[model samples]
Target: KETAAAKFERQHMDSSTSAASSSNYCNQMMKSRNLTKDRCKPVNTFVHESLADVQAVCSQKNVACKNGQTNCYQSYSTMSITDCRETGSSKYPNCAYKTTQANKHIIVACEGNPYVPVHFDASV
Candidate 1:
């Protein structure tokens, strides 16, 4: 199986230079929602293997499989597997079973006017 870092590298080797490409695509597809441009940020793509590693870490942190479901606390909101898969696209769909067992979502934090992307994927 591939490692999480390997999967991240494979999907985003050029992300530093062209991070907005995926966001742009998402925007076009979600135009009906009038989604704010500021709400969109670059995504750190993930595949099954990398997702698994993240889920494992989440479990260790007691963040995954909590409340009989996979969920984590992010500020005032509760980040759950449902939230993760709800935002997944057809191209990437969602991580497969083994991967879902370990990871479920990619969190991005925007810090400035241009909306910098801070990609975070972990297990626990």
Candidate 2:
């Protein structure tokens, strides 16, 4: 069975690539990464930092998530990330995305015994 941390990694982690220059980055990534499998993910963000570094955010000060969950934590340092937003006309199966590169402090919700990130809460 896939754990929440594992699922989070699949949906959000992309440590190898430093930057995305092509406009088609999101279109390709969102599909190859399996986000466009069953249905198009309306919006998503891919973190460029190492998994170890991202996971360490779980040790940071706790904060309220957008949904009012207190399990969320924000990264101490800003990190490189790529935001993928679906286009207005985007549809299921042929999901289109607008890619924006940025460096920001990421917020994620953590859970479980090892205290790993389970969701990408937001960025700032």
Candidate 3:
């Protein structure tokens, strides 16, 4: 079974390379990374930071969640990331996304004793 930490590693972590993203990045990644399958995900983010840096985010000040679980945390600093927003014409198995790289404070949800990010809530 996949844990949230593991899922986050697969879906968001990008520690291997910091290659400057090209315009086609989201289109390629959304497919190669499997975010663009059965249905195109409308919006997604790819964090360009070390796993440890991302994990440490869990220790930040507690932010509220609806009904709340002490799992969500917001980043204190702007981090580099690429945003993938699906095009209106995007169709499954043929997903099209607009790639935009920006540095913003991201909020993520973490769980378990190890406490690692599981979900990308927002970037403000």
Candidate 2: lDDT over CA atoms?
0.93
TM-score of each candidate?
Answer: 0.21, 0.96, 0.90
TM-score: the better of candidates 2 and 3: 2
lDDT of 2 by residue, 1-124 (tens): 9888898999899988987778898999999989899999899999998999999999996899999999999999999999999999798889999999999999999999898999999999
lDDT of 3 by residue, 85-122 (tens): 98887887788988888888888988878877888777
Ranking by lDDT: 2, 3, 1
lDDT of model 3 at residue 75?
88
Candidate 1 at 77: error in angstroms? Answer: 11
Q: For model 1, what is the alpha-carbon lDDT of residue 20?
A: 26
Model 1 TM: 0.21
Show model 2 residue runs off by greater than 4 Å.
none
**Model 3 CA deviation exceeding 4 Å by range:** 66-70
Order of the predicted models by TM-score, top scorer first: 2, 3, 1
Score residue 81 of candidate 1 by CA lDDT: 28
Candidate maximizing lDDT: 2
